[PDB]
Amino acid sequence: VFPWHSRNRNYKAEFASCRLEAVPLEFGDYHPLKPSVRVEVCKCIMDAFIKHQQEPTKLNALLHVCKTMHDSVNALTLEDEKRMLSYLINGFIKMVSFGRDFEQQLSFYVESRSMFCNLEPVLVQLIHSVNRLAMETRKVMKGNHSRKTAAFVRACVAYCFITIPSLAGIFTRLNLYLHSGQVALANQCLSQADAFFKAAISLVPEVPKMINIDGKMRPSESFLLEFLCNFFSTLLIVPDHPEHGVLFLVRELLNVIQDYTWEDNSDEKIRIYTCVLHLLSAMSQETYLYHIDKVDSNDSLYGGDSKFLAENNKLCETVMAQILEHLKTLAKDEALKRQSSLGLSFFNSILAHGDLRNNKLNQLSVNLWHLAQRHG
Amino acid sequence: GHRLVLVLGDLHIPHRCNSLPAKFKKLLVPGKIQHILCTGNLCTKESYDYLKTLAGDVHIVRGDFDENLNYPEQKVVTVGQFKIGLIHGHQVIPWGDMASLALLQRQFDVDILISGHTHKFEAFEHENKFYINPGSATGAYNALETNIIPSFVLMDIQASTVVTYVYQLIGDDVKVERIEYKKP
């Protein structure tokens, strides 16, 4: 079996060498841009407010209007009306700002969640705005959290954790788990970030073939590929809790995708494996490409321990073995077009990240190139 | 012959930001822009309509949070002598890796690659190819950064030379920088 090795990457030096030197402009220098059933009343009020109140305020009447408007949602409400109502309620929510009083803002948001349960887009906006609130608290207190706001940011993360499952959209759920986990992981809430990632991984096996997009049913294969790529890129920063095996969330996602029901005429699973090669190769470096403010990612947590690096290498070898097995089955299936496509992708992956100095990987790369050229 | 392209992205209106910075709207006046390449994450039709009022040709790719799921995942647009590749960048593993983007520049057979999931601005030439990460115009937060500086790129393309004017709002002042790129 062909093993894998990681080409050493010095991201600091590579960016420093390849960065283009920009010359700042002084004044004078040229730059191009230099000079109940009566929901109609509720809609009328909300339109006037959203169109003619352009500064945030520091509600009850507007809240009652929104409650009356939202209570009209039933089984007989069409999707267009639900979209319009969600837009109006989100316009109301946007302008309610309590400034530096963060706790009252979160109280307003929890009340809004308890008031606008049916309309999903309002719930999505509420999750997004609570995430913005937690990140704003981090920005105001400059990363160095106080004992008082630690509980508040944990409360915001818990609000996201309890509210996201109530959504119906499968891909909205996955992306919001991922983003809320990142938001939690930017505030030293490691345990809840791990729970967010585990929830996303557990929810992955449910995405169907056909998804609703603007009223039309379209395949969910490409969207799942995009989400999995986003998740793999996110897992680079995530610390590994010591009570489990190394690369625990990475390995859990790999198991999930291995057991996922992919289409028979589909080869995107091998594409995602090719992508996993990228994440593992990056994760095997001395210092990671990107970091969170004060979360010890695996680069400093394990410190590049030989055991952790070896485990990463062995996982790389297993994924490559799976990919090569699929490539051979492609040859036995005689549909050489997909074989050549995946061979091009795999050779490109090896060239991108693999340590070509090693003879064993180099021979595999040469064989893949020749296999790709053997069938046009 | 000057061709003006507005490289923009990560507005996140209204998920993370209510609107663009005050001064950027004043600077971005209609009529002076020919193409608008957006890395995505406008997240609403309002930002798309705002862009439609700034130029005629408006190319937008799909973000990780865009509402319109019909926007292409990746795109190649030829302006002047330059083929430009547009992708959000959240597909890239890891985000903003040089080799992982050189792969896309090989696949597209493209001269400029624009990708901006990491909200930090970047502009680098690797293997005689140009990569621009315009950052977030609205300064939307990401877990990867602490002090996000609102920024957007404006490329003036003429024959073979691209001069990139990078606008970043620091404090309350809009600094602009010049980057010279020439296709061999």
Swiss-Prot record, chain A:
The chain crosses the membrane at residues 155-171. Component of the heterotrimeric retriever complex formed by VPS26C, VPS29 and VPS35L. Interacts with VPS29. Interacts with COMMD1, CCDC93 and CCDC22; associates with the CCC (COMMD/CCDC22/CCDC93) complex which contains at least COMMD1 (and possibly other COMM domain-containing proteins), CCDC22 and CCDC93. Interacts with WASHC1, WASHC2A and WASHC2C. Interacts with SNX17 and SNX31. Acts as a component of the retriever complex. The retriever complex is a heterotrimeric complex related to retromer cargo-selective complex (CSC) and essential for retromer-independent retrieval and recycling of numerous cargos such as integrin alpha-5/beta-1 (ITGA5:ITGB1). The recruitment of the retriever complex to the endosomal membrane involves CCC and WASH complexes. (Microbial infection) The heterotrimeric retriever complex, in collaboration with the CCC complex, mediates the exit of human papillomavirus to the cell surface. This is VPS35 endosomal protein-sorting factor-like. Changing residue 282 to T: In RTSC3; does not interact with VPS29. The gene is VPS35L. It is found in: Membrane; Endosome. It is linked to Ritscher-Schinzel syndrome 3: A form of Ritscher-Schinzel syndrome, a developmental malformation syndrome characterized by cerebellar brain malformations, congenital heart defects, and craniofacial abnormalities. RTSC3 is an autosomal recessive form. Affected individuals show cranio-cerebello-cardiac anomalies, coloboma, microphthalmia, chondrodysplasia punctata, complicated skeletal malformations, periventricular nodular heterotopia and proteinuria. Belongs to the VPS35L family.
Curated annotation (Swiss-Prot), chain B:
GO terms for cellular component: cytosol; early endosome; endosome; endosome membrane; intracellular membrane-bounded organelle; late endosome; retromer complex; retromer, cargo-selective complex. It is found in: Cytoplasm; Membrane; Endosome membrane; Early endosome. InterPro entries: Calcineurin-like_PHP_lpxH, Metallo-depent_PP-like, Phosphodiesterase_MJ0936/Vps29, Vps29. Pfam families: Metallophos_2 (PF12850). Zn(2+) 1 binds at residues 10, 12, 41, 119. One of its GO terms (molecular function) is metal ion binding. Ubiquitous. Highly expressed in heart, lung, placenta, spleen, peripheral blood leukocytes, thymus, colon skeletal muscle, kidney and brain. Zn(2+) 2 binds at residues 41, 64, 88, 117. Changing residue 93 to D: Impairs interaction with VPS35. Impairs interaction with VPS35L and CCC complex association. Component of the commander complex that is essential for endosomal recycling of transmembrane cargos; the commander complex is composed of the CCC subcomplex and the retriever subcomplex. Component of the retriever complex, which is a heterotrimeric complex related to retromer cargo-selective complex (CSC) and essential for retromer-independent retrieval and recycling of numerous cargos such as integrin alpha-5/beta-1 (ITGA5:ITGB1). Component of the retromer cargo-selective complex (CSC). (Microbial infection) The heterotrimeric retromer cargo-selective complex (CSC) mediates the exit of human papillomavirus from the early endosome and the delivery to the Golgi apparatus. This is Vacuolar protein sorting-associated protein 29. It comes from Homo sapiens. The lineage of its organism: Eukaryota, Metazoa, Chordata, Craniata, Vertebrata.
